[PDB]
Structures are given as structure tokens and as C-alpha cells.
Amino acid sequence: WSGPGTTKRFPETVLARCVKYTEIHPEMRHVDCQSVWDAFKGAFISKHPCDITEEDYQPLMKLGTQTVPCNKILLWSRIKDLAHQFTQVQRDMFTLEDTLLGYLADDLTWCGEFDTSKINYQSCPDWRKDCSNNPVSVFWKTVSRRFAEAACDVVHVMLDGSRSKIFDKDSTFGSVEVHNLQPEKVQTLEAWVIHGGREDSRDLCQDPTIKELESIISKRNIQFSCKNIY
């Protein structure tokens, strides 16, 4: 496999994460940290890491079920490291990784094998280079498909103003989240384009990718507010 393998003491850390998340977030607590872990684990051990479906996570979704400040939401764009960086974001909005499941799998890579039934700590599929349906790729499509169906009022999103394709139509965001924003529920998509450096003046609200999003969003009955930042 061309990607890095499951992060060490994986099942050990996914449990400690669920432990902590339930102290801090007491209006959870009722959660069976093991049954959660058991549900997670069962989605991809025994399954070949290029053949995982959003269904396999159905088990764990049921247990992850949660409730969110639907009007304070900030959707999953690949780039969680660039964004967690603005005190405006962490503070004033709800990243998919302040949810439970989001919390557990943030910064982790994982996959198993199938001719056995044991995690693989050596290598894992690289969504771009190898098959595109690795467990991680699919986990995130799964939990964010939910996130998107849950959003109301103004829903935000953050794009790299460096990527060659600022708005990628195939991205988890482009392909999953965008088409699950309900207009009967969401007033506006406010997008924040993040200039890859000062010096780079340049209204990126202009870039056509962005405009393809303006256009798409509008065929959905949702309004579009674009904004630049650093």
C-alpha cells in the first residue's frame, strides 16, 4: 500500500478518545465506549480496504447519533489542519470533529486486511493513488453526509486558496455535502477562501471553481456569500 498504515495503538486511542469525549460532553455519557469501538472495528476488519461502503459504518452511525448547532455549522473540506487555526473558527463554529465520531477519527489512518481479520499497521490505501474507497475516505463521506443533511441557516465552508482547484467537485465536500444541503432548511452557503499567503492580494471569489459553486448552489435554491481571508 502507498499510504501510511493504521496509527499505532489505534484501538487503544480510539477508546481513550471516546472516554474523554464523554467526560467533557456530559450530555453524551450514555455511550458504550466499547460498543462504539466494536462497531467501528467491524466496519473494516474482514473487509478489503478498497471495498468499504457507507453501509459498513451503519452499525457505528447508529451509536454516534448526535445533535448539532445546525446554524453554527462549518462543513468538512479536506483541510482540517489549515482551518482549526483561526480563533474565529474553533470558537464560533462547529467542525465535524467536535462531533463524537469526528472527534474519534480526527488525524487517524486505519485499515485492515481480509485474508486475515487483523488491522494493518504497515501500509494503507492512498485514496488518490490506490483505490478510492479506503475505510478513512469512506468513513468521512459517511459522517459528513449526515452533517450536511443537518445544517440550517447559514452554513459555512473553508477552501484552500492555494490548491490548484479551490473548489473540487469530486471532493467529499463537492460530491457529498453540497447535494445534501436542504434549501428548505439552509438559507446560504458562506464560503471562505483562504489566501495561501499575504502578498497574494487577489479576489479569489473570482476563480472559476468558486463560481462553479456559486452556480451549483443556486440551482439548489440556496444563496451564496463568498469571502477572502488569511
Partner: antibody
Framework: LVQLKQSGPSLVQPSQRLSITCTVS????????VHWVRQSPGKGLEWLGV???????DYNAAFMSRLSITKDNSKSQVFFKMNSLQADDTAIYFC?????????????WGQGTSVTVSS | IQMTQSSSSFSVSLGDRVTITCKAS??????LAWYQQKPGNAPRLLIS???SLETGVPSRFSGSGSGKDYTLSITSLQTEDVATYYC????????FGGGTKLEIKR
């Protein structure tokens, strides 16, 4: 400081061309969209049309016949143009900054131009 | 889709707590905006998407309402808050409301 300053006719002969010119300051037409509403004492307020940041336009079912909004971004001004006028085409016509890039609530409105259609 | 503000005129004394109504042919799913027009002047944006306020606009102003029935409200009415009060829906092609004029009780 956002301003939308019209100018044009005011008095216009029946079945002519109405042609107002909205001219915007403290902002740009590639960033926001521009709506036209008119107010006649009889019909209250009515949405005529809209010239997006994009450039595309959407028109009110009724006037899509005789309507033509268009803009000149270099000089930040929008061009209303209505054909075969009439008695009731008498009203004040306003423009407005779309609040946000692409939305309908309009934050900063134009002064309005009272138009009277008569020989 | 049509906007019917009902009440067309109102008078209540200063410091009084006023309220207005808007209702649509059909569910507009919050696509609604309140505008405050003082005659002899262009109309003013007050509230958008049913409840989100706006700069300048005093904290006195209340955006509420849901489904088909929306609502403007001032807490302790002041003086320079007299005008016709209009309502815009934008779930489909924008339509407005009759109007609702305000008069002090002198």
C-alpha cells in the same frame, strides 16, 4: 461607504424607452448583485429584475417581454431599460446592493427616481 | 406566492411595544426580509432570513416567525421609528406585502 446613485429621465412619453442608470460607489459589481424594484402607489412594491455579479439575469415573469438590465463593471453602473411604456409604468424605480455575493435581501438601496409616464 | 401584511395602519403611543404580521400563500422556509420605509426616502434593510438583524439597526428590533407567519417587533418604541413596514419573500420570485403604516399616539 456604499452609495447607489441613479439618474436619467423622470418624465417619459407613453410607449417610449425608459432608461435609468444606477451608479455605485464604495463597492463593485463583480462582488455583489443588483436588484431593481419599483413602487407605484397603486401596486405597492414589485420586483422587476436582477443583474447578478455573474452577469446573468432573471426577470419578472411579466416584464421579461420589455426588460433589459445590463451593466458596465469598469465604471460601476447598471442599465435599466424598459420598452413600450404606459400609464401605470409610473412609479419610483430603485436599485439595491444584494446583501452578500448572491442573495435577495438588499442592504444599500438607491435614491429612487420618480418617473411619470405622460404626453 | 403572495405576501399579505394584514393590518395596514397602526397607532400606539411612544414607549409602547408594537408588532406586525406577514403571511404567505405557502411555506417560505424563512426566505423573508423586513424593510422600513420612511416616506421621502429609500427603504431600509432591517432583517433578513426572518431573524438576522443588521448593522446600525437598534437592538430593540425583533425578528421572529415560522412556517407561514412572520413578525416584526419593537420593544420600547421610540420616535424615529415611524414608517410603512414592508415584508419581502424570496423563496421564489420576490413578492412583497401590502404595507403597514405606523402613527404615534399624540
Amino acid at each position: 461607504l456604499v452609495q447607489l446613485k441613479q439618474s436619467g429621465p423622470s418624465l417619459v412619453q407613453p410607449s417610449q424607452r425608459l432608461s435609468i442608470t444606477c451608479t455605485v460607489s464604495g463597492f463593485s459589481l463583480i462582488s455583489y448583485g443588483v436588484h431593481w424594484v419599483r413602487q407605484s402607489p397603486g401596486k405597492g412594491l414589485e420586483w422587476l429584475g436582477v443583474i447578478w455579479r455573474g452577469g446573468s439575469t432573471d426577470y419578472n415573469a411579466a416584464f421579461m417581454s420589455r426588460l433589459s438590465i445590463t451593466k458596465d463593471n469598469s465604471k460601476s453602473q447598471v442599465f435599466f431599460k424598459m420598452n413600450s411604456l404606459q400609464a401605470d409604468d409610473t412609479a419610483i424605480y430603485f436599485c439595491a446592493k444584494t446583501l452578500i455575493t448572491t442573495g435577495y435581501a438588499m442592504d444599500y438601496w438607491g435614491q429612487g427616481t420618480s418617473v411619470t409616464v405622460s404626453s | 406566492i403572495q405576501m399579505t401584511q394584514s393590518s395596514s395602519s397602526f397607532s400606539v403611543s411612544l414607549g409602547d411595544r408594537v408588532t406586525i404580521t406577514c403571511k404567505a400563500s405557502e411555506d417560505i422556509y424563512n426566505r423573508l426580509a423586513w424593510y422600513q420605509q420612511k416616506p421621502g426616502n429609500a427603504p431600509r434593510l432591517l432583517i433578513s432570513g426572518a431573524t438576522s438583524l443588521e448593522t446600525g439597526v437598534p437592538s430593540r428590533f425583533s425578528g421572529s416567525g415560522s412556517g407561514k407567519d412572520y413578525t416584526l417587533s419593537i420593544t420600547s418604541l421610540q420616535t424615529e421609528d415611524v414608517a410603512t413596514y414592508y415584508c419581502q419573500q424570496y423563496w421564489s420570485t420576490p413578492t412583497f406585502g401590502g404595507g403597514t403604516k405606523l402613527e404615534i399616539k399624540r
